[PDB]
Write a protein that binds this ligand. Structure first.
Ligand SMILES: CCC(=O)N[C@H]1CCN(c2ncc(C(N)=O)c(N)n2)C1
Length: 271
């Protein structure tokens, strides 16, 4: 209460239960808030984040709410490392989930995963909010198998310069359109391109895009107009959708609303 804004959680209300893994900002734990509510607790490693800028942005993120978006519940700011408190996603990151062959996915389940993400992205686009680093590694899966988009916008606060421009060794080259790699031109349409690569990741059961290429080679391939090709599990109609995200001209790429319509049509035709 006293001492806390609407965006601030009291860390004393947290009970820590299990480790969930380690990501861009360090370790993530599963816990409860006020004894009952499941939460994930991202513990932000010292020196990793532009914390004041992130905290100001968290106030904006508190107002993003969609069933296919991992919900931000608040932040613990008064602290050693600061915490980000979010919705708990018991089945972990999508990339790893796709790679577990025991699931024996049907293609209708793969298309549903694409739809889940596309709905979240259509919501973000309706708010004029870019993800800026969409990829399977940044999607999460709940106990019901629903995929949700996470960490939206957070790349803006990463202090490790290896991540933050193409000149960096950890930049998401394989998820970037030509205008990002050539000129650093980010837009809705760079999220669209990344979404198409994400559909490729889903239909490829978690393969690395351009698996036989380095990042440098990938950039040369794409900037010469060449592309990923059709995963074996994708129908022609699904392939057409992902491929439409990769138009050399950003303005000729679809919106998320259009992509959603196309996905629904294929779900109806393939059902
Ligand atoms: C493929 C990527 C990966 O290994 N990610 C690690 C670091 C972030 N992460 C995570 N983050 C949040 C939640 C959550 N909200 O429940 C969760 N289950 N797991 C697991």
């Amino acid at each position: 209460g006293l001492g806390y804004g609407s965006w601030e959680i009291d860390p004393k209300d947290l009970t820590f239960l299990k480790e969930l893994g380690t990501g861009q900002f360090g370790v993530v734990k599963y816990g409860k808030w006020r004894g009952q509510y499941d939460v994930a607790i991202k513990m932000i490693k010292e020196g990793s984040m532009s914390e004041d800028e992130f905290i100001e942005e968290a106030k904006v993120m508190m107002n993003l709410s969609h069933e296919k978006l991992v919900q931000l519940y608040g932040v613990c700011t008064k602290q050693r490392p600061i915490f980000i408190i979010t919705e708990y996603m018991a089945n972990g990151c999508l990339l790893n989930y796709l790679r577990e062959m025991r699931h024996r996915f049907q293609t209708q389940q793969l298309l549903e995963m694409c739809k889940d993400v596309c709905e979240a992205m259509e919501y973000l686009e309706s708010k004029q909010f870019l993800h800026r680093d969409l990829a399977a590694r940044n999607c999460l899966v709940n106990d019901q198998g629903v995929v949700k988009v996470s960490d939206f916008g957070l790349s803006r606060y990463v202090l490790d310069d290896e991540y933050t421009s193409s000149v960096g060794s950890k930049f998401p080259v394989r998820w970037s359109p030509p205008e990002v790699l050539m000129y650093s031109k980010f837009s809705s349409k760079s999220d669209i391109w990344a979404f198409g690569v994400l559909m490729w990741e889903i239909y490829s059961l978690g393969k690395m895009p351009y698996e036989r290429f380095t990042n440098s080679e990938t950039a040369e391939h794409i900037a010469q107009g060449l592309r990923l090709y059709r995963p074996h599990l994708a129908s022609e109609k699904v392939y057409t959708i992902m491929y439409s995200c990769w138009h050399e001209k950003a303005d000729e790429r679809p919106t998320f609303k259009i992509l959603l319509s196309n996905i629904l049509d294929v779900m109806d035709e393939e059902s």
